[PDB]
Amino acid sequence: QNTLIYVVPNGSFVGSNIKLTYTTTDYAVLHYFYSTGQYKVFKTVSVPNVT
Amino acid sequence: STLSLVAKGAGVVEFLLTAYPYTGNITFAPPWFIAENVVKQPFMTYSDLQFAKTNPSAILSLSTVNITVVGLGGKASVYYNSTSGQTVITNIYGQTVATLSGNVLPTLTELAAGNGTFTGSLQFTIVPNNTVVQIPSSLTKTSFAVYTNGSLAIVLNGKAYSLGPAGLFLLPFVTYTGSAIGANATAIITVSDGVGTSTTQVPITAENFTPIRLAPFQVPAQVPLPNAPKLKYEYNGSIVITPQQQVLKIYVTSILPYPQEFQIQAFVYEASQFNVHTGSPTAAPVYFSYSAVRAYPALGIGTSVPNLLVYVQLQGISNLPAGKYVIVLSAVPFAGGPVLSEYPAQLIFTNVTLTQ
Amino acid sequence: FGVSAVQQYLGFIKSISVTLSNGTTVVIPLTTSNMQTLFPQLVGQELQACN
């Protein structure tokens, strides 16, 4: 119900990442914060460069 | 309300940039090296004060208001002075040489929200300038008036802007009497003969930038030396010159093509007259000699080994009495002096033991 | 979550070089037959879980 799964081939494993973009489910929030740039929020999860 | 301003990252300034020659062939990169004391993190201003006042933990644009390139003797700057809203460019001498309307510097855009990495574009080029260096005929039999490297120029929006002499900024350089000569040089050869005086000109291109390494025979020559200063390498290994030897076998390593001829000059100082601790001569050389090295391939022509075995000859080794000495080998170029000498520029044997 | 895993071509032994230095970093000319037959093992199992 709450799980997201990203699968990449062998060649795309290095730095395989997911970017989450959350948008308001509200018209007023889209309208009133278009200028400030805080009506949609994005973040990323990536495979760490590990030793 | 003024609140926490937290900077979890800034711009990154590195070395070994992709070289762009002044010639039309820009896709060739001679090894460039921004000189000492340029350590990342430029100063730049946020594009929005109000958001940064609370927390700049999101996607932002950073207007660069400080770019510093430090050379050996000075440093040039390109900074967007927001007080006047003008891009001010100063050369290595520390004097304002350019003022440009608006922000011609690109605005470093963050790659991610609350990350700290800001990316833009920085181009560079070389604009030749004038600086006369005189090589006397007392050591080469032919005088050389050399116009030096030129001037390093930052290229913004496709337009170049000089930042002072590139000889101090860029590596390699060739030091003659403390004067640095690099690519885009111009050597006027003054030949003196029985007829009189003649003058010819050989221009050094931006593709004749050519690092050249001088190495001892017992030290690897196919492996670049990272432990060699820009001006010299002091080999502390013990060397004893037999009386049957009048030539010293050394290696000359070339990373870029080297078509023009030169010579290796050997300056012999007494061990007491040379300060091995600092590597600087405390007195005039007690002897001088030269060996003309005509740049020719050893193996296959053109595709020979990047290492040349040079027999540095001496115009009389019996002139120096047996004892302890320091011998400095320096590359002095002939007939259109090309660019050479990084890591090392000179080869200083500090423990020469001449025995006869 | 309901999907089995398959082969991932996720690397290869870079080389087997030997130093022999009178000035010579001896980069070995890599031969395919020798290299495959020096590491022919089909199953190199790991030891610890989640590592």
Among B197, B160, B200, B166, which residue's Cα sits nearest to residue B183? B166
Among B292, B312, B183, B190, which residue's Cα sits nearest to residue B246? B312
- With tokens 């089909």, the residue in question is C42
Shortest Cα–Cα distance, B308 to chain C (Å): 14
Q: What is the DSSP letter of B321?
A: P
Tell if the CB–CB gap between B59 and A37 is shorter than 8 Å: yes
Q: Which two tokens stand for residue B289?
A: 């000699």
**Rounded-to-integer distance, Cα B7 and Cα B43, Å:** 12
Among C18, C20, C25, C17, which residue's Cα sits nearest to residue B221? C25
**Rounded-to-integer distance, Cα B174 and Cα B181, Å:** 5
3-state secondary structure of B277: coil
**Rounded-to-integer distance, Cα B263 and Cα B341, Å:** 13
Segment holding B216, helix H or strand E:
strand B212-216
Task: Give φ, ψ of B152 to 5 degrees.
Answer: -70, 135
Asked whether B288 and B266 are in contact (CB, 8 A), the reply is yes
Q: Is-cis flag, bond preceding B31, omega within 30?
A: no
Asked whether B168 and B73 are in contact (CB, 8 A), the reply is yes
- Residues 6+ away with beta carbon under 8 Å from B321: B354
Asked whether B293 and B309 are in contact (CB, 8 A), the reply is no
Q: Which residue of A has its CA nearest to C2?
A: A5
Experimental method: cryo-EM
**Rounded-to-integer distance, Cα B80 and Cα B321, Å:** 63
For chain A, the residues whose C-beta falls within 8 A of a C-beta of chain C are 3, 5, 7, 9-11, 13
**Rounded-to-integer distance, Cα B83 and Cα B86, Å:** 8
Q: Which two tokens stand for residue B93?
A: 């001498």
**Rounded-to-integer distance, Cα B54 and Cα B208, Å:** 54
3-state secondary structure of C48: coil
**Set of chain A residues whose Cβ sits within 8 Å of the Cβ of B112:** 44
Tell me the resolution in Å: 11.2
Q: Is C31 exposed, middle or buried (0-12, 13-18, 19+ CB in 10 A)?
A: exposed
**Set of chain C residues whose Cβ sits within 8 Å of the Cβ of A3:** 1
Q: Which residue of A has its CA nearest to C11?
A: A10
Q: Which two tokens stand for residue B57?
A: 């933990």
Tell if the CB–CB gap between A10 and C9 is shorter than 8 Å: yes
Q: Which two tokens stand for residue A17?
A: 């990442």
**Rounded-to-integer distance, Cα B251 and Cα B265, Å:** 14
Tell if the CB–CB gap between A10 and C1 is shorter than 8 Å: no
**Set of chain B residues whose Cβ sits within 8 Å of the Cβ of C27:** none
Asked if the C-beta of B51 comes within 8 angstroms of chain A's C-beta atoms, the answer is: yes
Tell if the CB–CB gap between A44 and B58 is shorter than 8 Å: no
**Rounded-to-integer distance, Cα C16 and Cα C31, Å:** 10
**Rounded-to-integer distance, Cα B92 and Cα B58, Å:** 37
Q: Is B277 exposed, middle or buried (0-12, 13-18, 19+ CB in 10 A)?
A: exposed
**Set of chain C residues whose Cβ sits within 8 Å of the Cβ of B219:** 23
- B 85-114 → A contacts, CB under 8 A: 112-113
Shortest Cα–Cα distance, A37 to chain C (Å): 36
Tell if the CB–CB gap between A41 and B113 is shorter than 8 Å: yes
Q: Which two tokens stand for residue B23?
A: 């010639």
Asked whether B292 and B315 are in contact (CB, 8 A), the reply is no
For chain A, the residues whose C-beta falls within 8 A of a C-beta of chain B are 36-38, 41-44
**Rounded-to-integer distance, Cα C48 and Cα C51, Å:** 6
Question: Any idea what the Cα angle at residue B20 is, between residues B15 and B22, rounded to 5°?
Answer: 135
**Rounded-to-integer distance, Cα B233 and Cα B223, Å:** 15
Shortest Cα–Cα distance, A18 to chain C (Å): 18
* Residue B323 backbone class (left: φ over 0; alpha: ψ -120 to 50; beta: rest): left
Paired sense of beta strands B280-281 and B274-275, if any? antiparallel
Dihedral angle computed from the Cα positions of residues B176, B177, B182 and B185, in that order, rounded to the nearest 10 degrees: -80
Sheet holding B197-203, edge to edge: B132-135, B142-147, B186-192, B197-203
Asked whether B248 and B320 are in contact (CB, 8 A), the reply is no
**Set of chain B residues whose Cβ sits within 8 Å of the Cβ of C23:** 219-223
Shortest Cα–Cα distance, C18 to chain A (Å): 24
Alpha-carbon Rg for chain A, nearest whole angstrom, is 16
- C 1-51 → A contacts, CB under 8 A: 1, 3, 8-10
3-state secondary structure of B63: strand
* H-state helical runs in B130-277: 137-140, 166-169
Paired sense of beta strands B323-333 and B262-270, if any? antiparallel
Shortest Cα–Cα distance, B55 to chain A (Å): 13
**What are the distances in angstroms from CA C27 to CA B55, B81, B211, B223?**
52, 52, 24, 13
Tell if the CB–CB gap between B113 and A36 is shorter than 8 Å: no
**Rounded-to-integer distance, Cα B73 and Cα B35, Å:** 10
With contact defined as 3+ CB pairs under 8 Å, the chains touching C are A, B
